[PDB]
Amino acid sequence: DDAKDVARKAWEMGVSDPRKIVFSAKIGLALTIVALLIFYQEPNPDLSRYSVWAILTVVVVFEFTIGATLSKGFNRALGTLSAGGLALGMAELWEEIFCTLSIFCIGFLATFMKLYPSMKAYEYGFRVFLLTYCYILISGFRTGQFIEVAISRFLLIALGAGVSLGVNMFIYPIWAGEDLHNLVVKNFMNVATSLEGCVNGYLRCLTSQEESLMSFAIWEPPHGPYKSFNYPWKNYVKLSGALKHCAFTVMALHGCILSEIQAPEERRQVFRQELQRVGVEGAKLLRELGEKVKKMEKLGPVDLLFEVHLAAEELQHKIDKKSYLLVNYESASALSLATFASLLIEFVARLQNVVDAFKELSQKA
C-alpha cells in the first residue's frame, strides 16, 4: 500500500526528471566496474584487502554535475597536498611531545579557519586537510614500513578517481550550464503564475542556488551552443535579481491576499474589471521573455513594454475619477484598496529594468 504509492510517486518524479535514474545507474556502473576489475584482474593477493579506498573514492568524489566533480575535486586536490606538504616538514622534525603538540595545534588552526564566515560551504578541503595530517601522523612512526603501507593507499585511491572522472564525463554529461537555463526560465513561469493567482483572488468570493551554479559553470568546457571560453556567465545571475525585485513585489501582493483588513468585497466589486486586464497583459511580457531566453533568440526584445505601459496608464487615470470609494473599522478598509492598486503600477515601473538587463545580456552573449 504505502510502499506501492511511494514507488508510484517516485516513478512519476523520475519520468518527469530523468536525471535521477541516469545518475543512479552511472554510480551503480562505476561500482560494478571497480568491483569486477578487482575481483578478476587481481585474484593473486598482492593486495586484495586494502583496496577499500577505491570504492570509497568512487562513492565520494562522484556528484550530480560535471562542474561539481572537476571544481570540488580540485579543492580536495590542494587540500590533501597542503596537509601532506606540512607533514614532510613535521616528519623530519623530543619526538612524541612534538608529535602531540603539532597534531593538536594544526587541528585547532584548521578548525578555527573552517568555522569562519561565508565559507561555510568551502569546508570539504579542511576536513581533507585534517584527515590527511592525522593519517600521516598515526602511521609514519616507523620509516621502515612507511612506503609499503603508504603507496598501497594512494595508487588505489587515484585509480578510483580516474574512473569516476571518465565515466561521469563521457556518459550523459549533466552540464551545469544547462541547469542554469532551466532555473532562469522556470522562474519566469512560476512568477507569472503567481501574479495570475494574486490578481484572481479579491474577486473570487461568493540567489544562493543561482550563483553557486555559476561557480560550477566556470570550469566546464565549451559544450555545443556555448561558443567560446569565458562565456559571459555573469549576466544570467544579474537577470535573476532583476526578476527578484518583482518577486518581492508579488510577495507583497500575496501578503495583501492573506491580510486581516481585507476590503468589503461588495465595495471592491466596482473597480473590478481593469485589474484583470492589467494582470493579463502583464503576464504576457513575463512569459515572452522566458520564451526568448529559453531558445536564446538573437533578435532582441523590441519594445515589448507598450501594452503593459498603456494598461498601467489607463489604470492610473481610472483610480482618480472614482476616488470616492477610497477616502472620506470603516476608515481602515478604504485606504486598503489604494495600497492594493498602488503596488501594481510599481510592478510595471520595475518591469523596465528587466528588459534592459536582458537586452545587455543578449548582446554580450
Site for its own copies in 31-70 (CB under 8 A): 31-32, 35-36, 38-39, 49, 51-52, 55-56, 59
Q: How far apart are CA 347 and CA 251, in angstroms?
A: 11
Pick from 42, 36, 74: nearest CA to 55 = 36
Residue 342 makes contact with its own copies by CB under 8 A: yes
The residue assigned the cell 560494478 is: 32
Which span (234-242, 289-297, 312-320, 356-364) binds its own copies, by CB under 8 A? 312-320
* 355 contact, one of its own copies, ligand PX2, none, CB 5-8 Å limit per kind: none
CB of 155 to ligand PX2, least distance (A): 10
- Binder among 85, 222, 255, 264 for its own copies (CB under 8 A): 255
Q: Cα–Cα distances in Å, from 146 out to 50, 94, 101, 103, 149?
A: 15, 20, 22, 19, 6
- Binder among 147, 299, 302, 327 for its own copies (CB under 8 A): 327
What's at 204, amino acid-wise? R
Residue 81 makes contact with its own copies by CB under 8 A: no
Q: Mark residues 268-307: x for contact with its own copies by CB under 8 A, - for none.
A: ----------------------------------------
Pick from 356, 339, 247, 246: nearest CA to 301 = 356
CB of 107 to ligand PX2, least distance (A): 15
With 0-12 CB in 10 A as exposed, 13-18 as middle and 19+ as buried, what is 146?
Answer: middle
Contacts of 253 (CB under 8 A, 6+ apart): 195, 198, 199, 343, 344
Contacts with ligand PX2, residue ranges (CB under 6 A): 53, 56-57, 60-61, 73, 76-77, 80-81, 84, 128, 131-132, 135, 153-154, 157-158, 161
Residue 149 makes contact with its own copies by CB under 8 A: yes
Pick from 311, 72, 282: nearest CA to 196 = 282
